[PDB]
Structure 1
Amino acid sequence: EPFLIGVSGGTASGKSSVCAKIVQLLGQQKQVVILSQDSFYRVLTSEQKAKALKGQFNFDHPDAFDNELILKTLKEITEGKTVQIPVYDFVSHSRKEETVTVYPADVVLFEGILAFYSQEVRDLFQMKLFVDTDADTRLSRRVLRDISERGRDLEQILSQYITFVKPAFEEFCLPTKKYADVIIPRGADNLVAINLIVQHIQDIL
């Protein structure tokens, strides 16, 4: 009976770090796994991938994610089954053939920028966390990582940000903050907020 925790927030908000911190503090036994929604980006068409290369594709809209595959993988995980998670390559906007196998855990953290958007998926989480971080701090991280880990150009990133990221964060992501059981300002640095969450998780288990 995996205890699923949904974690969301805007891009570069510290969602994954927050999860790492929860995992690390549960250590101080319980099997924990961290899944990323970015792993379920849809398989782009030839025309769509052309747009992406030209920066005309909206990877921040709820439709960009394979919502259907997500609900399925999460549902089986909920059933204690062993699943296969896809691997996405942000450099080419492509789902690799390679899959990653995830075995049953006691706690499963699902983190993403739109993890709470779909109501079917949202109902699977027995706890929902929204990570809040200054938009300017986030942008700065987004710029450095993209240039670094996703081989991209400054101007293109800023342009993508202004055109899609922010307009989408505000329209689809932010409203989901109301569904959270705990909102976390300052992200991983909020050790007080993360310790209460951890304590809560342990009291339930």
Structure 2
Amino acid sequence: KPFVIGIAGGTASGKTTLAQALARTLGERVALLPMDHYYKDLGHLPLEERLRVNYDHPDAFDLALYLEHAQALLRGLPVEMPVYDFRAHTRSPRRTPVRPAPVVILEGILVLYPKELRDLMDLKVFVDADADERFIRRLKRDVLERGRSLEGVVAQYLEQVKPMHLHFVEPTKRYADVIVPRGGQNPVALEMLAAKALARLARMGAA
């Protein structure tokens, strides 16, 4: 049985980085599935309509698919992970191979919302950061990498990302076993999580 780690947290909280650093520390032994790339394929709709969608509401996510893949890896099967194109606002034509592994990291802003996802997790983590600090990174990433305007980001954040976060994301902190501050730069928490996983991996091999 693969050690399942659930990593949730607000947008730009450091959960992507934390997840990757943990993935990098265990090498070939981890499969990382970012739920933030599993938005429903709305490619058949005009840009005007893909731009109105609230991408922070659980309904914007293809939970069916995400869970299908989470369960495939749990049975030692690989998946063709979809890739969301954040610049064009649609499911990209690009796919990415994710091989099964003894450690599966389920990372995303809402990976702790559906009970179906929680039941698959051995360790549930919430990466904590104050919205002001997170907004700074959100804005930077959006203007530098996603073709987003200054006004567009503020608008999106205030009428969507934020209220959705307070109402959906943030409450899932109650389901967390451990809370990680400064997810992006916390070598101590990283080591402890690696150690936790290393111990479980040892239980897999040892008998």
What's the TM-score once normalised by structure 1's chain length? 0.91
Gap runs ≥5 in structure 1: none
Aligned to 2:87: 91
Match of 2:41 in 1: 43
1:31-180 map, 5 Å: 31-44=29-42, 49-53=47-51, 56-180=52-176
Runs of 4+ in 1 over 4 A off after TM superposition: 45-49
Change in 2 beyond 3 A, CA 1:62/1:48: farther
Shift of 1:25: 3.5
Determine helix, strand or coil for the equivalent of 1:196: helix
* Number of residues of Structure 1 aligned to a counterpart in Structure 2: 201
- Check whether the contact 1:88–1:94 (CA below 8 A) recurs between aligned residues: yes
What's the C-alpha RMSD, in Å, of the aligned pairs?
1.7
Distance apart, 1:49 and its partner CA: 4.2
Q: Is the 8 A contact 2:53 2:60 kept in 1?
A: no
How many Å apart are 1:136 and its aligned residue?
0.8
SS at match of 1:189: coil
Letter paired with 1:84: E
State how far apart, in whole Å, the 2-side matches of 1:103 and 1:44 are.
Answer: 27
Q: Which runs of 5+ in 2 are unaligned?
A: 202-207
Identity of aligned residues (%): 45
Could you tell me which amino acid in structure 1 is paired with residue 57 of structure 2? H
> Alpha-carbon deviation of 1:42?
0.6
Residues 13 and 184 in structure 2, CA contact (< 8 A), matched pair in contact too: no
DSSP 3-state at the match of 2:19: helix
